[PDB]
Amino acid sequence: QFRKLQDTFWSNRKVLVNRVKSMYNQGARTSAKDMPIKTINIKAF
Amino acid sequence: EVKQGVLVERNMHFWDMIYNVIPELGLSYPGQRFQWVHSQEFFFLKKVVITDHNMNLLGVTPMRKMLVWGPFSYYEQRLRRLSALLHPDDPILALEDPHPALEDKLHITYSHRNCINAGFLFGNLMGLKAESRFGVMPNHHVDPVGAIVAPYAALTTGAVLVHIHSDMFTDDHA
Amino acid sequence: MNDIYARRLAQATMFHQLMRCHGTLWAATQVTKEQMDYNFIREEFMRVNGRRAMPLLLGAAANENLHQLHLSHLSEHCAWGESARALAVQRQTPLSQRVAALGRMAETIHQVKTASTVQNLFNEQISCMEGISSFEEEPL
Amino acid sequence: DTMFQYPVYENELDTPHLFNITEPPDFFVYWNVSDFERTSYPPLPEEDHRLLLPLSGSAPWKQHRKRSLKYLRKHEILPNYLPHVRQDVNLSVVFPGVYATRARLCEETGEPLPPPPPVSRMTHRNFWMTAHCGNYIELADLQHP
Amino acid sequence: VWLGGTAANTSLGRDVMPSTGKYINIVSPTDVAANISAGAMPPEAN
Amino acid sequence: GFHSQHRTPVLPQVPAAEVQQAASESKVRVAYLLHRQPVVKPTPHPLEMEMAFLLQREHQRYSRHESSESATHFMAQRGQSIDALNRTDPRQIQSNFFGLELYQDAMRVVLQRYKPERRVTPRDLWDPATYGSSNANSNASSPPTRHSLHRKLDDYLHLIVRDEASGKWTVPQTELRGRETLRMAAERAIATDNGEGLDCYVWSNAPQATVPNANDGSWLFIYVATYLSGRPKFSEFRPKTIDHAWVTRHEMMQYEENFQSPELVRVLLDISADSTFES
Amino acid sequence: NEEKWAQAAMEYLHEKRHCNDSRKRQHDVDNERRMAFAFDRYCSVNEKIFTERLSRLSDRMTEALETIKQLGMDHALEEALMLSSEQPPLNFRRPTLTPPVAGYEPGFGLDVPQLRSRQAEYPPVGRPTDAMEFGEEKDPSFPLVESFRVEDLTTQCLNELEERHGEIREAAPTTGVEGEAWEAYVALQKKALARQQLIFELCNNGELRERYDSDVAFRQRVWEERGMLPLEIERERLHEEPRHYAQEPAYHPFRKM
Amino acid sequence: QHASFTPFSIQPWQARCVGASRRKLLPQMLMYHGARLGPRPLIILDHSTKGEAGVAEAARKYESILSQLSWDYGAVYIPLHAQCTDSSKDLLEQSCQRICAVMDALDVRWTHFLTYSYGALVAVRMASSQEFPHRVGTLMSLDTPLVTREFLRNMEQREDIAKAERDINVPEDGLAFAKQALLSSLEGPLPCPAAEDESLYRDYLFDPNRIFGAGGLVRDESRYVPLKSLLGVRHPVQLIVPSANPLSDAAAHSEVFGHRRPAVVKCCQRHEDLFKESAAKEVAGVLGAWMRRFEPDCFISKRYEQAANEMGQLMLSTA
């Protein structure tokens, strides 16, 4: 259980930053509050 | 145990053994007295009763000791409510068989009826009179001499059982 | 046997700092009509000095600014810089911080791995303990 | 440890630990054969109350009075068999107990053990041998006036 | 989920143990009493 | 751990254009008590040493990561490197810590050449013999010359001077002129009287202490500052210095007979720094 | 290969809550109790002395300030009542294990210029007063700013602090000594902010000020409503508390042998 | 390099660092063995002192050992008075405020101690008692027992017999038999390795007519120091054992003060052979090896040496 639970993590964060990159190329400016990850700063990506 | 081909008493630390088998009692976090299962290995193990003579006059504190005295109820003693549900052939005892009849039969099991009647038959067959004195050689409490025949004989016919020295194998306590 | 030294040196520094703060505090107690005495001073120093760093993975923790104020920088004794574990209480362990930035997704994995190097963490720590660092006088 | 604690009362006058019985919490219970002759009466209280003058202004007498009354309600003496109890005098009825577990005999004869000296004054050794509210005393030591 | 509680310990004739600590992360018999998936056990079952 | 002045501003003071009458008439005098930081950390108690053993054992056995000896070992075990040269094995990492060869040689050099400074000064080894011979012969004894600043590096050493007119031990003083503040007063006291040969850190703004004089009808303000570096040349002192002294919190009480005021002793004691607080 | 480095890193981050050591025995647990108590008996003298000495100092500076108040210089006060904001200089030296040695330059004249580079500090600091200067609509004189712009800082600080507090009190409950430490810290902060907007309230309204001052009871009840309350530190324990038999820990007794 | 003890007195300028109240309690005569006193010396305490006649002679005993050991801080002897009739509680407190006063006038906190005799007790009374732990850094006794085994076991039995006397459940057999078991073996005083303090022990401290009322049951150690207080002292304490029949069984001392093996002098057989200069070399060897554990210079130097040789091993394992 533990393994696949902790691998699903790295899977989904790389998926998340991917979709965030593809949301930043279309010009959409996303603030930090509406994101689920809120401490995330997209300028770092 | 054998020193120089001669049988001598050793003092074995059984405590150490219990901690070998169940190492989890060594790891203590301050909720753990009340955790539901004490060893995830043997989950049926609940209390370990330590029987050792401590000669200090002060008893142990009431939380490491079980209450053995006085009335246990108000309205009726629950042991005699329970004894109605028990039947004489319900097994209570198990003894190791040094020479198992099959590979299967490990411990052979006795009932109320078995024990009481074994002791009564022995008691009757010899002869026994109230408070006549009748002895038992030690280390027989593991087989149906000290476990069954002797004390139930002493009970069924009024008699007085007597233990000799706690052990046998060494010449000195012979 | 660091902390043993560190609380002695904190006792040393602390009243030296009282010397400069006493003006502000005595100014304050006249308006509030509070009592100026040891019991006030010590709970004054407590809020200045003791500041706990929290899990840092929370993000609500790493945002907390109230320990960074000007008075709180001036009245604080230096004891944290003498013992490594005191420093690790007030802030956290230098590596644990920079990886926590990666945890709260406030940094790229690469950017973290870059500066996470032992050599760096050494120098940042000694600089921090000694009172040497960089300011960007203009933040953002 | 508020949720895990062994029960502790402040007055065992009911000898509650004999009736309400909680499992020893400890995983290792120590049980000899030597303790079958031990007698389990509750630890001696502070402020022994049997000596209290029942003045209507005194705090300890008031508090003990109302304790006893509550006990008398919980065992259903008070409303039931004894509808009106005006508690004025502080009563102590004591028995000359040896703290003997079962009934014994003489080794030299086989006679019943001789009647004990009637108790002159109240001592700490004498305390649980009295009649408080609801407590327990072995039958063996109630054998004499 | 840490499974523990004072309900594992026998209590005779009145329960004087603190009531907040009985079942910890374990369903009480009161929880299975209110949740049973059958219904109306027959009058002969008394 | 010192903070660096970061963006933090520092406000100067104002010599009010209004000239204060109470400054000219009723004498207000500003004295500065100068001390040096302890050069070394306090020599511990053996109790402290043993409880340090204890605490090291306990932290060591309850440490956040148990089996692993370090962060280095920890990341290494999982086959990953913290180091810049991406080395795994911790021992070869601490053999040359920085990958620089020049630093290696620096280390060899320091290895053979460096020896730790032995910490006690021959200054503070105290001899009862010649001293009790001088005190037996002259029948009167005054404390030995404290003129050395190197004397004992463990504690806070303060400054005490004696007036040539008074013949009594006292703090360095300066009278306060009209417009300037007390901070400025102490400042120009230390500055002018040491003639810009001192780096003097003044801790506070408001003065530390105050003593009354009925004879002079005046108030002295004692003021605390820390000596950093310089050459405290005492010839330049205007209020007539015979001798100076560098004095720990302890023996300021030794001077009470040749001190000018009984009040000034107690007060100077209360404002005096100490590295210990066992007294 | 980077993400797995990150995995190991995170591994290093996470703290595990782990049991008492199985090698511990009774005698040594008890003698570390003993050691601890000895040490606190030792620090008693030190900290009580330190305490009353700090007290004496504050007394002296109090009677000094009231001295210059009484002498009648109202300027001297207000320039001595404003905090001296300059930190100890770079030649202010932390007391070190050993004395400095004779004529030692770094590496005995062996220079590695790589190592003498000055570097950044992390995390980059920022404080609630940074919005008040380096942001838009800065004030001409920053340390000198007029009242209401401080008041807004106060009222916003309470809100966001309380907010964060609730947040992390939910996320990560903490108890015992460090839990109590965190809680005491936050409580003290709230107390400070409260007293701040109190002194503002007492400054802009002189009426509530003189009613506040006129009596005693009003002061303390007002404190109560606004969250300003004394901090109770329970008394120093020199010895071992006598235990009832019920006072045992919630785990299995440490193994004697 | 034999060097005697110079008599010495505290001068009035030094007497001001002692509070005006107890300024009466610092003595007239003192001594210094070496040329220099240092921040902290070796303070040597000894048996009761009547006049300075016996002081000069009692000096000679330690003269050899102290001469053999070179202590940069030298040493100080502080004489201790026999008794005073006025106050019954005067004794260990008089010696207390006395030692502390002398240390204050010499500007010394944190000091190593030495004792062959009653003084040892005094030193323990420092470390045991609250509010003078800070003054006594390290206690070393030569042969002087602070405790014996029988005090320990009999104290156990006393506590348990108290508890049980209060506890009703305990049968009268166990209690009576326990009381006979306590009276059958009663505590004799601590063995006295001093000629003149036998009077002090038998009369003042350990006399049976006072120390236990309800004789053999309740023992008031209030005159010396209770067992609990003793049982708490983690001040490092070194006991010295002659290699043949000693006093002061180290069993009890390793039980009470902590687990450490007492320094055992090979040369000696019994005590009184401790003050013979045949053994003074081993004695000073031990004393010195022990002093240097707590001296910052010495152990900082040492650990730096360890780290240095260590890095040396890394450098040679490099190539």
Place this chain on the structure above:
Amino acid sequence: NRSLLGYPLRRAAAMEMLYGGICIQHLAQPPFPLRKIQSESLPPPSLQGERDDLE
């Protein structure tokens, strides 16, 4: 009286606060306080309680 956190803070945390991030002081914790039970507040002894307590 009242405190701002409503319970007396244990000395360990206090000293650990005013010497920043350091607890070498009181680490030996006093045992928790007792909760006494009223034995006469307990309900009257019941028969069914006695039948079924054994389960």
Place this chain on the structure above:
Amino acid sequence: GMFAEELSIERSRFPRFHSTFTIQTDGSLNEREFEFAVPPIVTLFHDRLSAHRERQLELAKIGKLRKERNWETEQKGEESVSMACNALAFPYCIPKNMLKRSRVVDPL
């Protein structure tokens, strides 16, 4: 938060610590501890007082070493503002009728 027989130290926070002898640029040596594996005897460049000597060297170029005199600075600059605070003590501000002043600056 529960009663434990062991002494209560904050546990499972501080990862581990290896103490290290460190030689400051002034030749005195301290001992400080870190989380990773640190060699004994690390010789320290770029210390506090080294940075001080560097800043003194940099005040030598402009020749600003001399002094800064606040007392014989006679500046008449006076501005009376009605309501103003010291923002430099935020937790204790006070609303004083004040005197405006510039900060002392030393560019470097």
